Amino acid sequence: QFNIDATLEDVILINGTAYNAHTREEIRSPCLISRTVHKLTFQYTATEEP
Amino acid sequence: QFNIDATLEDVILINGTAYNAHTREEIRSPCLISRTVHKLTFQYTATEEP
C-alpha cells in the first residue's frame, strides 16, 4: 500500500493490475492511475506479472 | 472527504477536529495533519467549531 503523498507526484501503470484501497477497481495496463485513486493497494496477479 | 492529491500540497488544522478515512484518529488543533493521514474525512463537532 504505497501511500500517495504529495512528494511522489505521479505513478504510472506499465503492465499489471493495481487496485484502490476502498474501491479496488480493476485496472488494465497501460494507463495512468490518476489522483482519483487515493490509495494504491496491490495483489499478486498470475497471468501478467505486474 | 477532501482527496489529498498532489495538487493540494499541504493542509493545516487551525482550530477543529478532523479524522482520517480509515483510522479516523482523533485530532485536536492546533496541529498539522501531515501526509500520514492519507484521506481526510470530517464530522460535525459541537464544542469547538471546526
UniProtKB/Swiss-Prot annotation, chains A, B:
Location relative to the cell: Cell projection, Cilium, Flagellum membrane
Superkingdom: Eukaryota
Stated role: Electroneutral sodium:proton antiporter that regulates intracellular pH of sperm along with capacitation and fertility. Activated in response to egg-derived chemoattractants, couples membrane voltage to sodium:proton exchange and transduces membrane hyperpolarization to cytoplasmic alkalization to cAMP signaling and ultimately to sperm motility.
Domain topic, free-text comment: The dimer domain comprises TM1-TM3 and TM8-TM10 regions. The dimerization interface is formed predominantly by tight interactions between TM1 on one protomer and TM8 on the other. It contains an hydrophobic cavity that accomodates phosphatidic acids likely playing an allosteric role. The transport core domain (TM4-TM6 and TM11-TM13) displays a typical sodium:proton exchanger (NHE) fold with a six transmembrane helix inverted repeat topology. It contains an Asn-Asp (Asn-237-Asp-238) sodium-coordinating motif characteristic of electroneutral NHEs.
Additional information: The VSD and CNBD domains are not functional in mammalian SLC9 orthologs. In addition, the conserved Asn-Asp/Asp-Asp motif that coordinates sodium ions in NHEs is lacking in mammalian SLC9C1 and SLC9C2, suggesting alternative transport mechanisms and/or substrates.
Assigned protein family: Belongs to the monovalent cation:proton antiporter 1 (CPA1) transporter (TC 2.A.36) family.
Complexes and interactors: Homodimer; the dimerization is stabilized in the presence of phosphatidic acids.
Name under which the protein is recorded: Sperm-specific sodium:proton exchanger
Species of the source: Strongylocentrotus purpuratus (Purple sea urchin)
